[PDB]
Symmetry: C3
């Protein structure tokens, strides 16, 4: 069909871990879904010690926001690189077909913009990331990555062909950073991106992240920013990692239905404790909460979780089920 | 149903790689299965060089013993921390729902005990591990982890709905250790756990294990302690890794049926050479032996296997099948 | 059936990434498929800087060539170790059953040869590699590994039982090297293999590759040696990694059907962006090209791809589809 004849709609994005409002069951036929993102280079404090890096972002956040469309919609993105930025950027969608995912068509210097369109032909969650030729891992590992969800037009299904309907959705972007260190082990600081580049390449080549965080910083998804749910609520957690493997795990829960490699035409894996999301992939886990209280949601390399930053919390409200779990004899001397 | 009315039974555990006797087909309805484990902090020699660490164990072994129940049984564990220990401990079951898997309800100082109950609602093999708030990876990577198998009530099945019945079962716990090193590369020794802690955190933060072993030490599953089987015997190998990915492989065999991420409501992967068990997961592989002789069972990062310790042996008895394999021309000059 | 009565055929191998001619649908019943490979120790330049290593090869290439048979054929390999070599070698097939995959039966000193036969009882792609007792990871990580494809007799199938027929096939072998470094970080050179050995073991024990390459060198599958396809062509890419995990990704495409762990009795995963091939495994991805131009095929640890070598190219010929992707507004000031 002629694209000028399709319905169109403009989306307004939200900051992770929240996700812009959408309908699971598509209420139109295929449409052109219009997004705008503004690139922002900015200083970010990433840990409790105060370590500050020069982050490269889509729309001011690490990760960039989650975009949501349906299968066979067209994604039309206006990408803006303001003149207050210093570097060249572009965008590669793993959801898209051709021209290096879009990166060959979207190179923008500071002071430029561009508009890309692609057809979202395959249902799933997918990574998107900046990828300028010759400096690709530097941009990705400076935070310049996010994800897009392409829902089936009829929503998610279980393997029996019955619907799986989530009540809430969160997007957890997991970021490996490589802050350059001196031989004593202290982080270096730099005067310009160009003076940092070789140091950044050397740090990356060690293959050892200095920090691994959710939503851009140690502790970002804790305290006043903990994730929330009620007992009985169905929650979808989309989780991306653009550069290294991760192994997500809900401490005190499970993934009832998990698309570990993120693609909805496949039946989900059931009853997972932990799953493997390869670097360069988005995955998705569906869980119905059964107990109240605090949960930690982690990368289950527990060093990566509890020493390097890859840990957030849920606070869950409701009644405690002693059939599922109880303390028979509380800790006591003996 | 009211829990005080269910059948009960007391289990007596065995040391890995052996597994306490149980029935594949459950002969009772749901029951309360009572276990006791005693925590033991102890010195362990982990390699041929004599490197000695302060291990943290459930029941005196690394890994802790395999517990076996059926789906919808209740697990009731009496956890004892004798006053001859120095640290605080607890337990998190990945099989359980609520209170951080049990860790929030089971904190025991030296001289204390506690009794936890949980309903085993999902069939599979699962990790269990100690997880005291603020020192989680230190306990796990000191050996304080094991696994629990929750069998379907009707036993294991293939994808056609026919039974898979094992003749023998082994439990391989794989442990990554992070022994602190000085700048020359030699292992440090410490006077108290507290004096070691910061050094342990620094070693963990490198993300590079110094040792990766089966059953607690280099060579533990070799020689007089090699695993055994006969030609034609059906063997289930349960394999856990509480903190890092592993890639198991039977040298000279296969995994005929593999639940790589361990959950029995999913159809197994067939005919595997090698499979990925994510850190924080237990998996299970079923194989029928077809040839006698020595096999090595390894993590197929062969450096991890043959230089760092992640290798054991099977000795298999029976007839050699020249149809499956033969030397046509033995090695000779030419 | 008596093996002396079966048909026989002699195969002549080709250099990767090409694959010897074969039929997807087997035109004979089970047969004895005769191969010969000659071991070659040789100097290889692996990067643009000129770093030269002493490689250990099957048939002169890294990886060794792809062998192709059908399920229940017999593989009969004549392995030759000429007297111009210095080391002892053997071969382990992950496709085979017994005697450590063949390694226990195929030990050849320089000046010796041997002939092994095994029945290829399981369909899939599988790793093969040298594995001399006591020096296994040194040989594998010096390049001494390849793969074998065991096709079902009726060819590949989708999950509905309909045929998947590829028009072309490529074999990408991915190699992690561990070139020894001094404390300043410069590569060491050695006078004999024996003088290098301890240094090689120390480098391996860091677990950190210095190089990760396709087809034996940085840039090997680029320029005049880029992979090629036409729009509409069905391509199978077999990808092996004998020692570390990889996460393959076609930049600008997908894996339409992927056997991530390589075994054809399992239904493929659909619509993958990226997939996890565990170390010690071969996998296979089937894709129909839909857009022309340059693609990069990478390990999606982008540091491993673009800094350490794990990147090749496709050049695809044909018409551009503006329905799938177009630049609406080309980059411009604003
Ligand atoms: O049980 N979560 O480490
Ligand atoms: O074939 N096992 O390295
Ligand atoms: O989108 N490939 O990095
Ligand atoms: Cu950028
Ligand atoms: Cu990418
Ligand atoms: Cu403990
Ligand atoms: Cu855990
Ligand atoms: Cu060799
Ligand atoms: Cu092997």
């Amino acid at each position: 069909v002629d694209i000028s004849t399709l319905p169109r709609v403009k989306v307004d994005l939200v900051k992770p871990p929240f996700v812009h409002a959408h309908d699971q069951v598509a209420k139109t036929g295929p449409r052109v879904v219009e997004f705008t993102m503004t690139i922002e280079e900015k200083k970010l404090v990433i840990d409790r010690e105060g370590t500050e890096i020069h982050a490269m972002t889509f729309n001011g956040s690490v990760p960039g926001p989650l975009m949501v469309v349906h299968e066979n919609d067209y994604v039309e993105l206006r990408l803006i690189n303001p003149d207050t930025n210093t570097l060249l950027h572009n965008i590669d969608f793993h959801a898209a077909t051709g021209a290096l995912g879009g990166g060959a068509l979207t190179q923008v210097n500071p002071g430029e913009e561009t508009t890309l369109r692609f057809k979202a032909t395959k249902p799933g969650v997918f990574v998107y990331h900046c990828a300028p030729e010759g400096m690709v891992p530097w941009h990705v590992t400076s935070g310049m990555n996010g994800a897009i969800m392409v829902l089936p037009r009829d929503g998610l299904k279980d393997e029996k062909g019955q619907p799986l309907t989530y009540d809430k959705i969160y997007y957890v972007g997991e970021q490996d950073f490589y802050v350059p260190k001196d031989e004593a082990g202290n982080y270096k600081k730099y005067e310009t991106p160009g003076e940092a580049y070789e140091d950044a390449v050397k740090a990356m080549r060690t293959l050892t992240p200095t920090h691994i965080v959710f939503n851009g910083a140690v502790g970002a998804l804790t305290g006043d920013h903990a994730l929330t749910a009620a007992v009985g609520e169905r929650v979808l957690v989309v989780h991306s990692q653009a550069n290294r493997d991760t192994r997500p795990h809900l401490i005190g829960g499970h993934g009832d239905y998990v698309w570990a490699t993120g693609k909805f035409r496949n039946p989900p894996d059931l009853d997972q404790e932990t799953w493997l999301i390869p670097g360069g992939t988005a995955g998705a886990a569906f869980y119905t909460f059964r107990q109240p209280g605090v949960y930690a949601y982690v990368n289950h390399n527990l060093i990566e979780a509890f020493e390097l930053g890859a840990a957030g919390h849920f606070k869950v409200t409701g009644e405690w089920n002693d059939d599922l779990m109880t303390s028979v004899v509380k800790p006591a001397s003996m």
